[PDB]
Amino acid sequence: PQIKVYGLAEKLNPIKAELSNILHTSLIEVLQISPEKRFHRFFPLDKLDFYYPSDRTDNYLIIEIIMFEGRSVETKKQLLRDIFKKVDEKFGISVYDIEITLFEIPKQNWGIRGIPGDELNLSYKVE
Amino acid sequence: PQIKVYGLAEKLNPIKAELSNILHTSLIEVLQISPEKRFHRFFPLDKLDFYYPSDRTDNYLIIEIIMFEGRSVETKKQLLRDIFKKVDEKFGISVYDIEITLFEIPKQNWGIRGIPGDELN
Amino acid sequence: PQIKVYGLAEKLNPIKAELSNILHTSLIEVLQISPEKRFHRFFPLDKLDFYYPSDRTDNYLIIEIIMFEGRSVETKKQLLRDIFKKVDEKFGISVYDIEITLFEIPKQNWGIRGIPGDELNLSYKVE
């Protein structure tokens, strides 16, 4: 999985190092990926480049996860739940200020180490 | 829906605040979302980070919309047409210079307010 | 096809102009798109905004290609392999340091030059 995190620069920049650890722990625990396979991109946004509802706070976080298609509905829902729980518990950011979107990609639409994703023999199960 | 907008910094930055207002009106009117649900991210690009063909002017605008799966084809085409119309009318940007891409995501692949999107009310 | 490229700023900025030429050539040759249709966006990242595994280098390069659905599996796989080969050959970036992801979008989900993409008469064949 690839993660892309968007947030207000003044709020995201102080926490992004620990947020990276937290999010990676969630994908290890729920998706059973190798602890080594952390691919994260952070986009701290200027105030004028980020609009969110006036009843949310500036802690508002958008998390996009690009991942191999094929996981069960239950595993995916468990992932969303685990990220909500761990970010809230670690930073006190309310679940109302967190949004998560899973982008599923067929294995054959993904290139890794020079070959299409469906020709990889992975060390874990995509179910 | 979540919107991501891309354009040359010196063209997008003077207009992005008004453009946010226009795009939110369009999503409200066509998709019938509640008027508080504005989620927009803007990406003003340096000229060295943005390549587009010579038949597009420096007004070229890319508008990505990430939304729940489930709208009809007619609703979605009306959204594109409404965005094309309203952005052209408000800013004088030719429709030739506007690109819109809809990323539909199954409801169960979204986490909102702590729960999966297929379980919201 | 729309291309988005992500890499560390000090590594991506010296190569992005030639890389753009390399990527466009690959899409022309494999997808047979009209050679004027280059749409590329570059995202040079700060060191603190870019996490990748310890068995990758800071040449690590992410390539996202958003394209009309409808190409064959073999054509898409040929696109992946061609980009890997030509990027490796031109810049000496090992193919483990390159990752490619195709985002396929139905034609009616795209607005181009004022109309939905399923109503466009194209100058090439999508498939």
Side-chain angles (χ1 to χ4, degrees):
Chain A
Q2 297 273 344
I3 313 187
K4 303 159 92 178
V5 175
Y6 311 72
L8 197 64
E10 72 168 269
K11 301 297 256 189
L12 176 57
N13 281 342
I15 64 165
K16 51 182 183 198
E18 289 191 321
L19 182 59
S20 190
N21 297 336
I22 292 297
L23 296 181
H24 189 47
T25 298
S26 200
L27 276 63
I28 293 168
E29 287 170 10
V30 189
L31 300 187
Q32 315 270 252
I33 64 156
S34 160
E36 303 294 324
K37 306 194 289 246
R38 178 199 309 225
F39 299 89
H40 296 174
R41 284 163 285 166
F42 288 84
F43 301 87
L45 299 175
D46 194 275
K47 211 296 188 209
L48 310 174
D49 291 322
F50 192 23
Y51 288 79
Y52 51 83
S54 50
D55 57 272
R56 306 322 137 91
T57 72
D58 50 16
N59 297 289
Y60 185 75
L61 273 180
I62 289 164
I63 297 170
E64 300 174 358
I65 305 183
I66 322 299
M67 73 204 271
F68 282 158
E69 144 188 76
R71 275 107 171 178
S72 68
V73 173
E74 274 316 307
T75 301
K76 286 188 279 156
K77 295 190 164 185
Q78 282 180 13
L79 180 67
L80 304 171
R81 214 176 42 171
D82 193 66
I83 284 158
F84 277 127
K85 186 246 190 220
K86 290 170 143 74
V87 174
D88 189 8
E89 142 194 305
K90 173 69 178 157
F91 307 103
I93 295 170
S94 154
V95 294
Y96 289 74
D97 281 335
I98 302 160
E99 182 160 0
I100 318 163
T101 310
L102 311 182
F103 291 72
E104 293 189 275
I105 308 300
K107 295 228 252 203
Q108 74 267 21
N109 290 3
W110 209 312
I112 292 154
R113 292 179 174 255
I115 64 201
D118 66 320
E119 309 176 5
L120 290 182
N121 308 126
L122 309 161
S123 212
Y124 59 97
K125 176 59 159 187
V126 184
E127 329 167 292
Chain B
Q2 305 266 154
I3 311 181
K4 302 160 95 186
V5 180
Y6 309 77
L8 209 62
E10 65 188 286
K11 298 292 204 173
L12 176 61
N13 287 340
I15 65 157
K16 55 187 178 198
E18 318 98 85
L19 175 59
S20 180
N21 298 350
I22 287 302
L23 297 173
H24 193 49
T25 293
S26 183
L27 264 65
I28 287 161
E29 267 162 15
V30 179
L31 305 189
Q32 315 179 57
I33 69 168
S34 57
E36 74 286 17
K37 301 299 224 251
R38 188 195 301 227
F39 300 93
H40 300 174
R41 284 161 287 164
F42 286 87
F43 300 92
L45 298 168
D46 184 277
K47 177 135 179 52
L48 302 158
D49 294 320
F50 196 21
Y51 294 67
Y52 44 86
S54 85
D55 66 353
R56 269 97 183 155
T57 65
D58 298 342
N59 287 334
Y60 182 57
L61 251 189
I62 293 164
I63 300 168
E64 292 169 2
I65 296 170
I66 306 142
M67 39 186 298
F68 287 156
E69 217 179 40
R71 273 88 175 198
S72 51
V73 179
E74 322 92 62
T75 296
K76 282 179 300 188
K77 290 183 176 188
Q78 272 302 60
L79 176 63
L80 307 167
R81 293 197 178 251
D82 193 72
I83 292 170
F84 277 129
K85 185 180 164 71
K86 289 334 207 308
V87 168
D88 179 43
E89 286 186 350
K90 179 67 211 299
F91 300 104
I93 299 171
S94 155
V95 302
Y96 206 101
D97 287 326
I98 305 163
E99 186 152 339
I100 311 162
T101 308
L102 312 179
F103 293 75
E104 298 185 277
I105 304 294
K107 285 206 220 184
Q108 69 262 37
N109 284 14
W110 284 81
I112 292 161
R113 294 189 281 289
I115 81 156
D118 63 323
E119 289 161 35
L120 297 154
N121 278 306
Chain C
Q2 289 275 352
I3 305 190
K4 304 160 114 188
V5 177
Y6 311 74
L8 194 70
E10 75 193 59
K11 301 282 177 176
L12 180 61
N13 283 340
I15 74 178
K16 56 181 164 201
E18 179 56 18
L19 177 58
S20 182
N21 294 338
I22 296 297
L23 300 177
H24 193 47
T25 295
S26 273
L27 269 63
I28 292 170
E29 288 170 1
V30 173
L31 300 180
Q32 314 266 61
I33 54 165
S34 85
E36 337 304 334
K37 292 174 71 77
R38 183 200 299 222
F39 302 85
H40 299 180
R41 284 164 280 163
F42 290 94
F43 301 93
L45 302 161
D46 183 277
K47 184 203 167 271
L48 290 324
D49 291 324
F50 195 28
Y51 290 76
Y52 48 81
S54 51
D55 66 356
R56 262 75 170 168
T57 79
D58 64 348
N59 301 283
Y60 186 62
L61 189 67
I62 300 178
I63 304 167
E64 285 176 5
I65 300 178
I66 298 107
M67 45 183 316
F68 293 152
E69 65 177 355
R71 280 125 179 150
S72 83
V73 174
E74 194 48 63
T75 292
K76 288 180 283 161
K77 286 174 170 214
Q78 194 192 337
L79 181 64
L80 298 179
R81 291 186 231 263
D82 194 71
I83 285 153
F84 281 115
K85 176 206 93 102
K86 304 267 210 50
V87 172
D88 186 3
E89 283 176 359
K90 163 84 36 181
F91 307 100
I93 302 169
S94 310
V95 307
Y96 65 73
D97 265 342
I98 298 149
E99 177 151 357
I100 310 169
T101 311
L102 314 175
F103 291 76
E104 277 177 292
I105 309 267
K107 272 177 328 172
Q108 71 269 26
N109 277 11
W110 215 310
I112 295 164
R113 296 181 314 99
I115 65 133
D118 66 314
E119 301 173 28
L120 272 180
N121 297 294
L122 301 173
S123 76
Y124 58 98
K125 182 145 83 114
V126 165
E127 281 268 60

